[PDB]
């Protein structure tokens, strides 16, 4: 996962989960990448799948 083209004002809402470095399960890449941006680049990918 590359979050270079983020932020994005909207995300489709399918569920394909990813696990963030904050232990939060992100529902999809779009939602995860927008969180990366919001964190000003501090949140990272821990692994694919739910946390």
């Amino acid at each position: 996962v590359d979050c270079s083209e983020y932020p994005k004002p909207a995300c489709t809402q399918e569920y394909r989960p990813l696990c963030g470095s904050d232990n939060k399960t992100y529902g999809n890449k779009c939602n995860f990448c927008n969180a990366v941006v919001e964190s000003n680049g501090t949140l990272t990918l821990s692994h694919f799948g739910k946390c």
Binding site: K8, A10, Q13, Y15
Partner: protein, 185 residues
């Protein structure tokens, strides 16, 4: 299985929009971004209960898809959770609507705008969408937006979340019924 319930494809999970039919043929509607590149659909995470196979998919530009039921036993309720749906209608600004999805359950709000363009990126733009102040979260894609016993839209996407509040865009359901020649029941 009914409107709002979880649906699983090879790739992930979406929500069933509405049960529809044509003649004696049963299908369900969901988002086109869910049908894109999905062939088979199941009712559970274990993929053991087959539902059917994708028959059509329109995304980007629009955001609707249709899956034809191949499972014969499964009850195919013409409802949204237990809410009966008897007809389809056009959304209007100020209309009170309700969304149901496999992750967040049921949430209400109102139609705040029509004909919105939403750009999901990479050339994935959709046009003609219904804007609302209803929230949605991953997994909720494709579930129904209804008002009373009226079918109104299919969940496509948006921002925010249910805790903080958000904005959700839906595909007008009339456009899919008419494209596929099916009707709600």
């Amino acid at each position: 299985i009914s409107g709002g319930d979880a649906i699983y494809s090879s790739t992930g999970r979406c929500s069933l929009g509405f049960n529809v039919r044509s003649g004696s043929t049963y299908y369900f509607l969901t988002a086109g971004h869910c049908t894109d590149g999905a062939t088979t659909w199941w009712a559970n995470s274990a993929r053991t209960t087959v539902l059917g196979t994708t028959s059509g998919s329109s995304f980007p530009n629009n955001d609707y898809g249709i899956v034809r039921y191949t499972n014969t036993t499964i009850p195919k309720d013409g409802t949204v959770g237990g809410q009966d749906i008897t007809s389809a209608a056009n959304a209007t600004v100020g209309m009170a609507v309700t969304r149901r999805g496999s992750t967040t359950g049921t949430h209400s709000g109102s139609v705040t705008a029509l004909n919105a363009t939403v750009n999901y990126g990479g050339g994935d733009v959709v046009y003609g969408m219904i804007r609302t102040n209803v929230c949605a979260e991953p997994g909720d894609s494709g579930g129904p937006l209804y008002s009373g016993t009226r079918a109104i839209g299919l969940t496509s996407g948006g921002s925010g979340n249910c805790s903080s509040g958000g904005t959700t865009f839906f595909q007008p359901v009339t456009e899919a019924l008419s494209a596929y020649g099916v009707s709600v029941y």
